[PDB]
Amino acid sequence: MTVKLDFEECLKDSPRFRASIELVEAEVSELETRLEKLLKLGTGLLESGRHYLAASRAFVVGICDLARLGPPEPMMAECLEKFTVSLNHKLDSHAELLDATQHTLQQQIQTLVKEGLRGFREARRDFWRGAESLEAALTHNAEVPRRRAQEAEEAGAALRTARAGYRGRALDYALQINVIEDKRKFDIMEFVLRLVEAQATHFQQGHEELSRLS
Amino acid sequence: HYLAASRAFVVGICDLARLGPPEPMMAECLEKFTVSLNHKLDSHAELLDATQHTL
Amino acid sequence: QYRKELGAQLHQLVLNSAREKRDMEQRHVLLKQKELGGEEPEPSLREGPGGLVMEGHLFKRASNAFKTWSRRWFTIQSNQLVYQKKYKDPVTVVVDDLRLCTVKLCPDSERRFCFEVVSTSKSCLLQADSERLLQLWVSAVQSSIAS
Secondary structure, eight states: OGGGSOSTTTTTTOHHHHHHHHHHHHHHHHHHHHHHHHHHHHHHHHHHHHHHHHHHHHHHHHHHHHHHTSSOOHHHHHHHHHHHHHHHHHHHHHHHHHHHHHHHHIIIIIHHHHHTTHHHHHHHHHHHHHHHHHHHHHHHHHSSOTTOHHHHHHHHHHHHHHHHHHHHHHHHHHHHHHHHHHHHHHHHHHHHHHHHHHHHHHHHHHHHTHHHHO | OHHHHHHHHHHHHHHHHHHSOOOHIIIIIIHHHHHHHHHHHHHHHHHHHHHHHHO | OHHHHHHHHHHHHHHHHHHHHHHHHHHHHHIIIIIOOOSOOOOOOEEETTEEEEEEEEEEEOSSTTOOEEEEEEEEETTEEEEOSSTTSOOEEEESOGGGEEEEOOTTOOSTTEEEEEESSOEEEEEOSSHHHHHHHHHHHHHHHTO
């Protein structure tokens, strides 16, 4: 992103600068499309996960109750109780890992696509409205003859507006591109990091009781 | 369905990383977190194999 | 253990950045309010390798039947005038050598700020965006004819 946009030539407005403004946009759009694919797959894991733990919790009640109804044995009567809480306690750790997974999907990825391209697009929108404005401001300035002074003055007043506000706009657009370059790595790295924290935390809950359960 | 869902998701997360420039974090760190994730899925698969065997 | 270690470098890098885009933001609103100019870009006539160098947009007449005028980016270099076809793709010659050229201020065109470059092999029509860009482009060429 950052180096597909010449910040250097944004007041100058060279074919270099114009080539860059067209080239940088395709990686923002690529990226936006990949961000959405993870936000949907993430909810895909949240629905199958949750359906799996609804099936799991319901099964755990029924495997224990069927054994409790089983014929009398005093070591089985205590052992199954140790088992029942272990079975559910491991699940609670796993329900918590979906909810942690859910929170990071909101804080990082859903936030990134919802918020983080808004200001670049608001600058991009007005910047191509000013580029279009500038190109005709110059067209209408070039195409009026010398004896048509008044029409030339009107078009040059519009150009002075267009060239200034297009310079104004190229800086913002340079800014919000420079922001997303840095931001993009940090949020996905944070997201794999917060994910596996909840994994380490879910697996430790089932290991903290591994000794008692053995 | 959960493992397919998770596996597709971990494939989706990797896909962000490769679009950005190659750097120590994306290239190595980010992949090491995500391959341990595919390994954890397979261990979860052996538990659904043992739940089915047991049953 | 890898997570928390990396997370400490990761946060510091984005703390570093969070400052970083604040400095760019801080200069860009100083630039926008106070020094942000509306005049058109002006080339720089500075000596380079081979003699005088200057580069910038000019209007010229195309192979449309009316001779329709149109905007291209032009460079003066090594006693030569070229024009750009697309950026990074190779340029086209306008005058073989500017030092066998004449540069006509052209008072009989009605075309605002137009000049004509008449050289030994080749002629070419041109137009500047402004009377300043006319007198500097005509002078950059006239000094180039005097090289």
